[PDB]
Structures are given as C-alpha cells and as structure tokens.
A paper describes a structure:
We previously showed that LJ0536, a cinnamoyl esterase purified from L. johnsonii N6.2, is active towards a variety of substrates including short acyl chain aliphatic esters and phenolic esters. The structure showed a canonical α/β fold characteristic of esterases, and the enzyme is dimeric. Two classical serine esterase motifs (GlyXSerXGly) can be recognized from the amino acid sequence, and the structure revealed that the catalytic triad of the enzyme is formed by Ser106, His225, and Asp197, while the other motif is non-functional. The structure revealed a prominent inserted α/β subdomain of 54 amino acids, from which multiple contacts to the aromatic acyl groups of the substrates are made.
We determined the structure of the active site mutant (Ser106Ala mutant) and also co-crystallized this mutant with ferulic acid, ethyl ferulate, or chlorogenic acid. We validated that the active catalytic triad is Ser106, His225, Asp197, since the Ser106Ala and Asp197Ala mutants displayed no catalytic activity. The apo-LJ0536 structure was crystallized in the presence of protease, which facilitated successful crystal growth (the mutant Ser106Ala was also crystallized in the presence of protease). Overall, we observed no appreciable differences in the backbone structure between the apo wild-type (WT) enzyme and the Ser106Ala mutant (RMSD of 0.33 Å over all 244 Cα atoms). Trp160 of Est1E corresponds to Phe160 of LJ0536, and Phe160 adopts the same conformation in the apo and each of the ligand-bound complexes. The bridge-like structure formed by this residue in LJ0536, which lies on the first hairpin of the inserted α/β subdomain, is present in the same location in both apo and holo structures.
Numbering used by the authors:
A (entry chain A), B (entry chain A): -5 to 245
C-alpha cells in the first residue's frame, strides 16, 4: 500500500484447517493481485513460484501464495488432500483477496496441479477473475487416474486401493477416485476472459497435450510452447515462464 | 454384534471438523449396514430418518446417520457447507463403515440433498456400495441454482452473491456456484448395482422429474411414485417410504 511494502506471512482457515501463505505487498493505494497455486507435493516457495511473485511485485502487482492442505506449512495430512479440497482451499483464499479494499483486478496463476485448481476456480468465478495463467496445467491427472498410473505408481483404476504408497508419502484412494471424474474442461471452459497457457515441449510429467487441449476449450487463450523446457521451467528456462506470466498480467 | 445391541452416539472427523452420528447396532457377528444422509437444513434425526433406521434395525441391518457439516450437532457454519463438502463428509463416514469388521454389505440411503450426496458417492465407489435408495433426491438443486431461485429466494445465477440470506440462515455463494456445475447424473450413472427411487407425486420441493431422470440414467433402478405424498413422506405417507426402503435392502 502507500505506507507498507514487502513480504508478510498470512494465515487463513478452511473447514477447521489452517492454511499458511505469503503476501507480496506492492506500492500504491490500489493495485491488482495474483493468487499463485503450487502443484502436487510442491509448496508455495518453489523457485518458480517465488520468481513469479518477485517479478509481479517489481510491476506493482501484489500476490499471495498459500500452501494447499496436506502441503508445506498448512494443516491436514497429505493422504487426505484431493483436487476438490484444494479447490475449496483456493475458494477460501479468494474470499480473503476479494474482500481486500486495495485489490482492483484479481488474477489466477497455477502450475501443474495448481493450474487445474486455477482453471476450475476461474470457471466457478468467471464474473470475478480477470485473467488466468496456467503453467503446465496437470489436466492429465484425470486421464492418469483412469489409466491407473500416477507418475509411475500403478493400481487398478476400476478398484482404487484405500491408500497408495507414493515415494515418501501416502496418496489417498479418494484423491484418485475424485481425479477420474473431475469435470476439468467443462468447468474451466466457462471462463471466457484472457488465458495464457505456458508449457515446456520436453515436459515429462504433464504432456504438452494438456495445454493444447486447454487452448482448444477456451474462448480467449494464447498458447506458448517453450522449446526444450521441462515441467518446472528449471534453470535456463525459468525466465521464459516468469516473463510470459508477468507480461500477461501487466496488460 | 453378538453381545451389544442398541443405539450409540459416534463421532468422526473430516478436515478438522467433527461430525456427530448415531449408530444402530443390531444382533449378530456379521450384518449389512446402511449409511443414511439427511437433506438441506435437516438433521440426522428427522422422523423419516429415525423410522428408516428403526425399521432396518428390526431386520438386523445396522445403520449410521450423521449430521452433515453446518448441520445439527456437527461442526462448521451452515454458510460454509456445499454439496461437495457434504460428499467429503460422506466419504469420511464411509471410511468408518468400510473398516468395521462386522460390516458385510454397505448400502446408501439419501433423502433430498442427501440423495444427491448418496448418488454421487455411489458413483465414486461403485465397486464397494451394494445398493442405493434415493428418497426425493434433490438433483433439481443444480437446475434451481442455474435458474437463480433456491426454494423461493432469488438471485442472479450469472453473478451469484457472496452470501444469500435464506429464512433464518445464510447460504454461501460458493454452495450456489458449486451447485450450478455439479456433475450429478454423470457421476451417479457409474453405479450399475440396484437402485430404488422413491418420490411423492405431490412433492412441491423437489419435482418428481428428478427421480424420473435418475430412473433413465441408471442401469438397474426401480422407480416408486407415491401417489399424494409430499417431500418428507409425512404422516400417512411415511410407511410407504420406510417399507420400500426396508424391503429393498433386505433383498
Ligand atoms: Na508440511
Ligand atoms: Na462430468
Ligand atoms: Na483463443
Ligand atoms: Na482459445
Ligand atoms: Na447446529
Ligand atoms: Na460436467
Ligand atoms: Na432400470
Ligand atoms: Na434404470
């Protein structure tokens, strides 16, 4: 605002769970604000999300970035997280943002499973959200759950187990049952304002076909295929993601 | 079980909210169990739900019936309830039931908005749930939200308000935004085991067309239109609901 600029740890509640976030507060009495969503097993402070928030703040666009339930600093077990209750988290965050009297336009920015949360939240609030940026949006998590193979762990999609050991973690069976039937494109397509789609051609985690499919479903989308980039836009590719996202939201 | 029979208040947790339920425990080491779901602004102990549980217990079929979040004895504000987080409650209850070693087959019984929760939960667990009974299932809540008229309170469906005063209560705007886009028939139609549909011809709250539509979508449904009955199967109509539900679950 006019008097305070910089970072601040902030906390919200959704159904009895605390969610922990970081707010980047820019100069000025009135400013736009992006809500930034991390992906599956990530957190609000990955290099990509930090550099997005930093670049936005340089342009005086505020942002907030929260850990989803079951992630990072927030409450809840990872095993109890699903894409649906992450959309419920995202709605609690949007409650916080849309009632801040300094906030002019609201933008959603989502990476990977956070891109599905962003795209679906924008389709539920198409009258409020002004622009969306999806980075490698993980709409393929539905097709993966239907196949029975979530990033190399396999299971019977017709009889999903109660829980699924997953590296160091335990994935809920209810996450997978929800994933199989999520109306990702149906809900997301209701957002007819500008969308920017950014996907690396060498993403091994989410097929670029996900963004190609979003680009067909949206009324107003621009697709950027970043030649050679991986799922996280790591190292030499990071600035491609950061620049496109910042340029998109500045106008 | 073999040693204890009768009622018991039971408590479960979903995301930091306590849910309060009543278990009817029948005779025998092994028995089937129905999970019974109340409707919008109701509670686990309406006359209809009590008499259903009582009649089932006479047949040695166990049951549990919980207050949804935002209702009755359970945690959470009514304003924060949606059909989606009631499905999340229902999944926490099913976790409890499917891990009880006395439980043989599991049945879902839902009245009104509880019928939508039941039908959608059965479509997410079509491999586990054995039979479903829907009583006046409120699948019309989606069409109502799209129209902008929820039981006589009106609003702009293209720009749903943050909150909607509703009699003595405050309905969340997010309830309505979710309702408009709920994939009720898509998800429910995945359950191909036996379904019993019970609807009163003079229901003024949920059009009988809801059960007529479910009867077309299911692979194995039986439709019972109760001549003259109202939304709650009150007074002289109650036994029509209770008898059909009990007969259905006994075999
Ligand atoms: Na953590
Ligand atoms: Na669907
Ligand atoms: Na376009
Ligand atoms: Na497009
Ligand atoms: Na209460
Ligand atoms: Na749908
Ligand atoms: Na049939
Ligand atoms: Na049928």
């Amino acid at each position: 605002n006019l008097y305070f600029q910089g970072m601040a740890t902030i906390t919200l509640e959704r159904d009895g769970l605390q969610l922990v976030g970081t707010r980047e507060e820019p100069f000025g009495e009135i400013y736009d604000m992006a809500i930034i969503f991390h992906g599956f097993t990530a957190n609000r402070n990955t290099s990509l999300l930090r550099e997005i928030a930093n670049s936005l703040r340089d342009e005086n666009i505020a942002s907030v970035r929260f850990d989803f339930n079951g992630h990072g600093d927030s409450d809840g077990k990872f095993e109890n997280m699903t894409v649906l209750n992450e959309i419920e988290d995202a709605n609690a965050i949007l409650n916080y943002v849309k009632t801040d009297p300094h906030v002019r336009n609201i933008y959603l920015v989502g990476h990977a499973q956070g891109g599905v949360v962003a795209s679906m939240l924008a389709g539920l609030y198409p009258d409020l959200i002004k622009k969306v940026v999806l980075l490698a949006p993980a709409a393929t998590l539905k097709g993966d759950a239907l196949e029975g193979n979530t990033q190399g762990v396999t299971y019977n999609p017709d009889h999903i187990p109660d829980r699924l050991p997953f590296k160091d973690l335990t994935l809920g069976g209810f996450y997978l049952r929800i994933a199989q039937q999520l109306p990702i494109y149906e809900v997301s397509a209701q957002f007819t304002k500008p969308v920017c789609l950014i996907h690396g051609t060498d993403d091994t985690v989410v097929s670029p076909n996900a963004s190609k499919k979003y680009d067909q479903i949206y009324q107003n989308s621009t697709l950027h295929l970043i030649e050679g980039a991986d799922h996280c836009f790591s190292d030499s590719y990071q600035k491609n993601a950061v620049n496109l996202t910042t340029d998109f939201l500045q106008n």
